[PDB]
Structures are given as structure tokens and as C-alpha cells.
């Protein structure tokens with residue numbers, strides 16, 4: 213179960229974050245892991261599509277090769293804090309698993325600038341027991357985390373040394389499909 217009420221960035225610039233470009237997860241902190249894929253890859257695109265906040269997601273397990281895509285409309289709770297009911301889609305946006313109540317994640321942008329971000333998410337999927345996940349994002353795949361986002365990790369009272377890197381994972385990303393999924 214999740215335990216954190218993440219605080220959104222003061223002065224969060226929604227149009228800059230939700231600009232249609234891709235964010236790569238470079239490092240993450242799961243407060244409730246199991247044995248787990250310590251090795252894992254994720255990226256998202258965040259945009260506005262004909263006046264709706266949207267996110268497209270891409271997950272790739274570099275060992276199992278398990279790959280899946282999602283699209284969500286984000287509903288606003290407050291500036292920088294959203295609730296996202298997701299649908300699993302193929303890369304072209306065709307629905308594989310419809311939106312359903314109880315399949316949602318929350319999404320809080322704790323820090324963002326033009327290149328980097330720190331987010332919190334709490335995923336709810338069926339009767340699954342999931343915990344808090346923090347992710348360091350970058351516009352450039354595998355970029356080393358800079359001092360602004362690392363300071364934000366510290367300011368959240370987290371230890372960056374505890375985050376797991378995705379940079380050494382033989383990750384590959386379908387960023388073109390993320391971009392096009394925004395409309396789906």
C-alpha cells in the first residue's frame with residue numbers, strides 16, 4: 213500500500229511538462245519492492261490533446277522482454293497532482309484492456325525543469341498491493357542526474373544513493389509511439 217502524500221513543485225509549469233515530449237525514467241525508488249525487477253525500463257510522454265491532459269506510458273523488461281503500453285487522461289486534483297485511469301493499448305493505440313474503475317495511478321510532479329523531473333506515483337491495479345514509487349526523469353535517455361534534480365531528491369527527504377539506476381540495463385525505448393499515443 214502507498215503511504216506518501218507527495219508535495220507538488222511550487223510554481224509547477226504544467227504547459228512545459230505536458231508539452232508532448234518524452235520523459236525517460238533514469239533512476240527510481242520503490243518503497244515496497246518485492247524480490248523484484250531491479251532491472252526494468254520505463255518512459256512516458258505527457259501532453260495536452262484537444263484540451264485534455266494525457267500521458268502515454270512504455271514499460272520494457274530487459275530480461276523477460278515483456279513490453280506494454282498505456283494511455284491515460286489525467287484528472288486534476290491540484291497543480292502538479294493528478295489521477296490517471298489507464299488503458300492498456302498496443303503501440304498504435306488500439307485498446308487491449310479498457311479503462312476500469314480501480315485501475316488508476318496518482319501522479320505528482322515534485323520537481324521539474326526543462327530537462328529533468330522528480331515524480332511520485334501510486335499505482336492501483338485490481339487487487340494488487342503496490343507501494344510508493346519515486347522516479348527521476350530526464351528528456352535524454354540515460355542522462356546522468358544533475359544537481360537540480362538531485363537536490364530535489366534531498367529536499368523530499370530521500371537519499372539518492374538508494375535509487376536504482378536504469379542506465380546500465382540494455383534498455384531500448386519506443387519514443388515515437390509514445391509521441392503518437394497522446395491522441396488515443
Ligand code: HEM
Pocket residue numbers: 237240242249252253254256269271281282298299300309317319331333335337340345347
Ligand atoms: C513514471 C512512472 C511510472 C508510471 C506512471 C507507471 C505506471 C504503471 C501502470 C499504469 C501500470 C499498469 C499498466 C497496465 O496494466 O495496463 C504499471 C505496471 C507496472 N510497472 Fe510501472 N509505472 C512507472 C514506472 C515504473 C518503473 C520505473 C518500474 C520499475 C520499477 C515499473 C514497473 C512496473 C511493473 C513491474 C508493472 C506490472 C504490475 C503488475 O501488473 O503486476 N513501473 N506501471
